[PDB]
Symmetry: C2
Subunit: 132 residues, 2 copies
């Protein structure tokens, strides 16, 4: 009965689509919405394993809904939920402050912090339609 | 549900992206163990689809096209011929390898190569939506 749109990957209770263009974290966050969705939010390890597997045959950077203004602020998913501990370790430019803030992206397996103005791909998601 | 989880539901087919990287024959069997077959392109819409689907990668991905030597035309697994004006096969089309000549798609273009070379594959099987 179509749990999800064509061109999307269906997993568990969510669906994923891979960012066509390569823009800053903001445009990436907009585009996910225009498609009635939100940037990737990892809740479990299985989630991480699903994604990594889905981009293992790549080496480009993909944006996720994790970010912050500066180190005095914690890492928060778009919806405001914190980064559940023991999921992965954020690396990269973890000790800085940029006008646009800091945003985490996953690449070749690991997660990295970075200046959100810098363009990159991303992953979007939205609950799977399970109503026949 | 049209397709299984982890696949990509497109048009009337479902698409999965190989996990392992082996040669055409083995790659062909992995699509079989999943009630499917190697990618078959029937139009450019299909090609454009698969292209975008693997834009984020630089690896080579097998499809169901192959041939013994240039004396033979390219054929899809099902045995049907390659429709004209879909894409032209770049690559080593002069050579003739002992285990056949297989076609893979990489960074937009379709290349011919020794069939016994490791590369990821793309599987497909009728969707679901009666």
């Amino acid at each position: 009965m179509a749990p999800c749109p064509q061109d999307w990957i269906w997993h568990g209770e969510n669906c994923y689509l891979f960012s066509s263009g390569s823009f800053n974290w903001e445009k990436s966050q907009e585009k996910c919405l225009s498609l009635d969705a939100k940037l990737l939010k990892i809740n479990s390890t299985a989630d991480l394993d699903f994604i990594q597997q889905a981009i293992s045959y790549s080496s480009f950077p993909f944006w996720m809904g994790l970010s912050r203004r500066n180190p005095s602020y914690p890492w928060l998913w778009e919806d405001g939920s914190p980064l559940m501990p023991h999921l992965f370790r954020v690396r990269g430019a973890v000790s800085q402050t940029y006008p646009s803030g800091t945003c985490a992206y996953i690449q070749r397996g690991a997660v990295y912090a970075e200046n959100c103005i810098l363009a990159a791909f991303s992953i979007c998601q939205k609950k799977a339609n399970l109503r026949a």
